[PDB]
Amino acid sequence: MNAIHIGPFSITPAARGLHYGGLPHHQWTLYYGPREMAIKTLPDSYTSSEVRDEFSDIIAEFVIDARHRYAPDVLELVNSDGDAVLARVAVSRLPEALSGCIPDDRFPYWLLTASRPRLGLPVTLNEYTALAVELSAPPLAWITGLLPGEVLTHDAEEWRPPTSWELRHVVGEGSFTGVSGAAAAALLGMSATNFRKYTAGDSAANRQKISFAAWHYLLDRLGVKRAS
Amino acid sequence: AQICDEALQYAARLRELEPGWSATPGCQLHDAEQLWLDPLRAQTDETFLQRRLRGDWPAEVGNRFANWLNRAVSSDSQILGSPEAAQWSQELSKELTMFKEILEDERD
Amino acid sequence: ILSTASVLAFERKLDPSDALMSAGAWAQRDASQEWPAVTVREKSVRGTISNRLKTKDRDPAKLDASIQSPNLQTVDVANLPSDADTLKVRFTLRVLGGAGTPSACNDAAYRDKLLQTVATYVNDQGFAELARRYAHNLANARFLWRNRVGAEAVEVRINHIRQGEVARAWRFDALAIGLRDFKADAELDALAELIASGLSGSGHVLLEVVAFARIGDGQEVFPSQELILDKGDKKGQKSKTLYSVRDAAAIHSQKIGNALRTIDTWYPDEDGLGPIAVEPYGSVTSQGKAYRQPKQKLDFYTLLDNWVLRDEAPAVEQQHYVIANLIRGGVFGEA
Amino acid sequence: ILSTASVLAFERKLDPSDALMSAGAWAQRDASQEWPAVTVREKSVRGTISNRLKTKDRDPAKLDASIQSPNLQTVDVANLPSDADTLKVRFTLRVLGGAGTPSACNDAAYRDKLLQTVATYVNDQGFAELARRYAHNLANARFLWRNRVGAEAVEVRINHIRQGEVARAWRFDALAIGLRDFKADAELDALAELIASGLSGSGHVLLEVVAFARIGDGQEVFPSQELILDKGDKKGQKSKTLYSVRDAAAIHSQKIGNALRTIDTWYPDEDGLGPIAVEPYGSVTSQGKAYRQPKQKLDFYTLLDNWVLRDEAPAVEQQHYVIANLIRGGVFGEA
DNA sequence: TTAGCTCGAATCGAGCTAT
DNA sequence: ATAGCTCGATTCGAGCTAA
């Protein structure tokens, strides 16, 4: 039938068909871009919303694995012993002055990492809050692991605009954020027709590229980056 | 209490297998628990192994099973430090008490 | 701001070899090079029920049934030949140096501070008093743990190897040198200053330690004990297995180093029982009671952290103990 | 615009073999072809609590209870025989060449410019400084990592095996050529153009390196350690496992090649440590830190793009670091 | 760094569509 | 909400001057 596109995923059918049993059948192939994840032979009587439900569990497992393997580093605020965790914050990057540390009594508050070779830094509550404000991680910061490092960089000379498939990771009905194109356009203060030109694929007539400020502001508003 | 039934239900279905399955040669076959795993080997050996279950009265298999379940508890020092591991050991002692009680009067 | 590293592993200094066992006759010790090695043999044993019952096994109906079928065991034993009454052991001991340098560290500022802390210690107090007590533990055969408890006469020979040939030979008598008194002797000071040469990194030290003990004609010696997987039958349980390297009963290398570490005397509890091994939290496995408790703040870590971080130098007398644990090495530094 | 390639997988040069270890006595190293191999055996240990406690296990009742419940584990131990004091490690090293050519590279324009950049480096100066420092690590027993820290006399013999036979022989003293400085020697320079010819690609070259070390009788040798799947019982925990191929303890090939890689003295930090291995971001496993961090712009990746993309070549000593990392090989490019 | 200016090319909004 | 279009107006980059 038709190739079902769910965000960065694309379920394309086989051009030829087969007859498993007596009923008509086709091979549906799940794709994550150029990566093939599954082939499932399905009847032709299924609707698109039912093949979507058939392939939904593999997509859910992929999203769980992506969220787990790209989780931001967690910092821990502890007392002068290191046993009780008073507050924990997930950070996009570690503090600059972290070194290998074991808490002692001369300082009341210590900011240690969650990794077992715990780096640390003696802080007060005011400096801890300054570091937490500066270094905090957005709730959907795990999607940055699925994106290239040259589309997320803040250096304008080394920045490359995201493609349509890399843009489907963060905007779209079946995206990893779950926001529609109209909602993304409303977040950028532009028309939905212009954003559809950003998300347009294979239509070489009137296809546009997103800009540096628009891309980084969209990543700010969706909760993916720059939301410390 | 539900653990020792399916442990006994496990030994229930070993009673339907060959009478001398544990009597075959082998470098490692857990001979310490073989007095309870294979009850039907006493019929094949009238005196070589029937009196082995009679004389020894194996009840340390439950102690071996107790060491196994000690790996199945959460390895938290908070439970060991506090009294959480106390009644956990009290329920471990009593639940292995009637579990081992079944094994000694198996010869009846 | 300087703080302790998360990992502070130290390599082990004064690493001994595995001490062999060979048997022979007394006064033949000057030609004991080709003495026959002590071989582990096998005895099948049984034993009556002698362990303390739990007040539920004390009924005469089942207590008498307990001795009806006593347990059977197969024990490994190490005995001398009939025409031999002297136990001979041999191992080599090296002295490395660089106690303050850790094998692995995390904080560069803390590693530098620890090196400067141990550098000031060496100039203020050289590696001499620790080297002396390390010489006494080489002098008396404390590494013969229970092989000397009732020995009539124990003699220890200590050689020094430079180019495969002995340079200076040290001969001591272990019965005169007690296990509780750390006295002064001219021969021991010659040994101690050689230990100090290796500890300070001046030169290479390789000591071949040979000890002779008078036990008796064909008695039993007591080597190191291994572990048994216990996968056999209930009659051949094999409850005991002794260390042997190549068909010869031997002692673990960490067993030899444990007795060589028995120099710690200064723990805040009463010292009438004798010296103990230098370890963090001052513990010996014999009693199961640890000296230098963190509540009394005389352990390794409280003394080390105060002397490095807070610059709280203790007396000269305990800082001999914090360096002593740096000698044995360790995996100090938790998460 | 000459963007960098997404895949830049590079084959590694200086491929070493596994270092087999056999034992024996000194002065017989001229006929060391039938020395018995260093065997892997098993021994059991127990220890006390020597780790820091999380402020809750420091209670005297809890601490003594842990001593009353000791941790029994078995360990993998390798020792010399009691009549043997010499340890020899034998591996073969083959030099490949063609270091500038990647196995995988997307942009053909980037490959041509990278090959042009490597060829520009070769014309200015060959692989002479590289092979001089490589032969210096072959001169000393750096690949004999922890068996050299207490060696009394360690000696290497390097043989050029062209047609399965010794085309040219070498004999060095490893203690004289220390692991701190890279000086000049006529015999070392004679070895230098042998690897330099291999690195340039003129012809096939293959070496055999045998390093005899005066360890001591029955002393502890240190081969490469293995991973434990951690599935068996806690008593038979097997907390340590060493590497062996056929009942003979050996050292990993990448363990040997890492020591030969230790030529990087050009990192900006102070030289109290000394040379390190040439790998990107300058990672030191023991110190848990990284020299040549990308912040001060002296790592491999920023220098490579500066040299190739925008044509600003680095310093000549930094150009040695880039090519040494190119000789080292890796999965470069945006993975 | 301020303060602009062409010139072709890409983008932007607001109309419609299709599915 | 997806997907895409046209059309005229606005923006955009890389040259340039001007100071």
Side-chain angles (χ1 to χ4, degrees), chain C residues 49 51-58:
Chain C
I49 176 166
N51 44 3
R52 205 165 292 203
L53 298 185
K54 270 73 60 185
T55 307
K56 297 296 289 183
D57 206 16
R58 290 186 195 168

Side-chain angles (χ1 to χ4, degrees), chain A residues 142-158:
Chain A
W142 62 268
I143 320 182
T144 59
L146 299 155
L147 284 171
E150 64 184 0
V151 310
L152 305 159
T153 182
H154 277 276
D155 189 356
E157 293 179 353
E158 322 289 346

Side-chain angles (χ1 to χ4, degrees), chain A residues 112-136:
Chain A
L112 315 179
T113 55
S115 70
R116 296 299 292 161
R118 313 217 291 237
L119 275 53
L121 159 62
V123 292
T124 53
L125 282 180
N126 189 359
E127 316 176 317
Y128 155 76
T129 54
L131 281 170
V133 163
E134 164 205 19
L135 296 174
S136 188

Side-chain angles (χ1 to χ4, degrees), chain C residues 4-5 8 11-12 15-18 20 90 92-94 96 103-106 108 111 161-164 204 206 208 225-227 243 245-246 252-254 279-281 283-285 287-290 293-295 301 305 328 331-334, chain D residues 41-54 58-61 63-65 67-68 72-74 77 79-83 85 146 149-153 214-220 222 233 235-236 273 285-289 291:
Chain C
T4 57
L8 203 62
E11 279 176 351
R12 162 194 54 242
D15 46 350
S17 174
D18 275 325
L20 271 296
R90 173 176 177 262
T92 64
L93 178 75
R94 285 202 255 101
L96 277 300
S103 68
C105 185
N106 263 6
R111 204 264 291 277
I161 297 101
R162 287 281 187 178
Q163 321 279 348
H204 189 274
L206 173 58
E208 178 176 357
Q225 210 180 30
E226 293 293 327
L227 291 169
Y243 192 31
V245 297
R246 312 179 58 182
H252 294 140
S253 70
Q254 83 266 4
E279 293 179 353
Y281 312 110
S283 192
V284 296
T285 66
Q287 65 182 357
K289 169 84 178 64
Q293 295 297 109
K295 187 269 183 181
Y301 295 121
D305 291 311
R328 57 161 299 211
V331 290
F332 316 138
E334 206 58 38
Chain D
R41 79 207 204 283
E42 192 75 29
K43 82 177 185 180
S44 313
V45 298
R46 63 181 292 166
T48 64
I49 301 299
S50 66
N51 290 318
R52 312 209 218 211
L53 314 173
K54 278 88 170 178
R58 292 180 181 177
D59 274 298
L63 174 57
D64 289 4
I67 300 144
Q68 284 292 323
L72 277 296
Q73 78 267 18
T74 175
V77 65
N79 286 109
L80 301 178
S82 53
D83 52 340
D85 63 358
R146 208 196 163 184
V149 68
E152 199 168 8
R214 261 305 281 279
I215 302 300
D217 289 329
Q219 284 294 281
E220 182 65 26
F222 314 104
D233 60 330
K235 301 289 99 175
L273 179 73
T285 296
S286 294
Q287 296 189 122
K289 74 182 295 295
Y291 309 98

Side-chain angles (χ1 to χ4, degrees), chain A:
Chain A
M1 294 182 286
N2 287 317
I4 313 176
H5 294 338
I6 318 178
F9 307 101
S10 66
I11 310 167
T12 62
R16 294 178 65 88
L18 73 164
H19 267 299
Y20 172 72
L23 283 72
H25 277 286
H26 271 90
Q27 264 192 336
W28 291 93
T29 314
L30 189 44
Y31 271 80
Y32 178 72
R35 165 185 157 188
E36 183 178 1
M37 293 182 286
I39 284 183
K40 294 174 75 170
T41 298
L42 283 190
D44 291 331
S45 70
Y46 273 119
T47 60
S48 87
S49 296
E50 280 177 342
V51 184
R52 173 181 299 120
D53 189 359
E54 187 83 330
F55 281 88
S56 67
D57 55 296
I58 307 187
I59 291 169
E61 294 293 328
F62 180 92
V63 170
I64 288 288
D65 282 332
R67 189 178 325 143
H68 274 260
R69 74 177 71 251
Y70 299 121
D73 302 301
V74 189
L75 282 177
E76 310 212 332
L77 182 69
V78 295
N79 50 308
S80 59
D81 304 329
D83 44 3
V85 194
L86 316 180
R88 61 180 78 264
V89 60
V91 293
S92 54
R93 45 179 169 100
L94 286 187
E96 208 86 353
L98 289 183
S99 62
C101 174
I102 293 174
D104 209 50
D105 194 1
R106 43 193 209 290
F107 296 110
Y109 291 116
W110 304 76
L111 190 69
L112 315 179
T113 55
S115 70
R116 296 299 292 161
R118 313 217 291 237
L119 275 53
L121 159 62
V123 292
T124 53
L125 282 180
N126 189 359
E127 316 176 317
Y128 155 76
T129 54
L131 281 170
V133 163
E134 164 205 19
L135 296 174
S136 188
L140 299 163
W142 62 268
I143 320 182
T144 59
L146 299 155
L147 284 171
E150 64 184 0
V151 310
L152 305 159
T153 182
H154 277 276
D155 189 356
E157 293 179 353
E158 322 289 346
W159 181 77
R160 192 249 309 166
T163 68
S164 160
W165 181 73
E166 290 163 6
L167 186 52
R168 294 291 180 89
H169 284 70
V170 294
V171 298
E173 183 181 0
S175 67
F176 296 137
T177 62
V179 294
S180 57
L187 282 169
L188 289 191
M190 75 164 66
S191 50
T193 67
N194 189 58
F195 207 88
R196 275 194 291 270
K197 296 189 186 184
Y198 293 159
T199 44
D202 192 74
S203 50
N206 296 115
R207 63 181 293 165
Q208 303 171 162
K209 297 296 289 183
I210 207 166
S211 55
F212 183 90
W215 174 239
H216 285 267
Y217 188 65
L218 186 62
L219 291 187
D220 186 74
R221 295 308 306 281
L222 296 182
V224 186
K225 195 170 65 65
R226 197 68 189 93
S228 59

Side-chain angles (χ1 to χ4, degrees), chain C residues 200-237:
Chain C
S200 296
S202 300
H204 189 274
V205 179
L206 173 58
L207 308 179
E208 178 176 357
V209 181
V210 190
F212 306 91
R214 211 206 269 279
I215 298 291
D217 299 90
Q219 276 180 294
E220 162 181 359
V221 287
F222 318 107
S224 285
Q225 210 180 30
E226 293 293 327
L227 291 169
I228 297 101
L229 310 164
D230 271 344
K231 312 297 187 174
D233 56 335
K234 313 298 297 173
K235 293 183 182 179
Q237 288 189 353

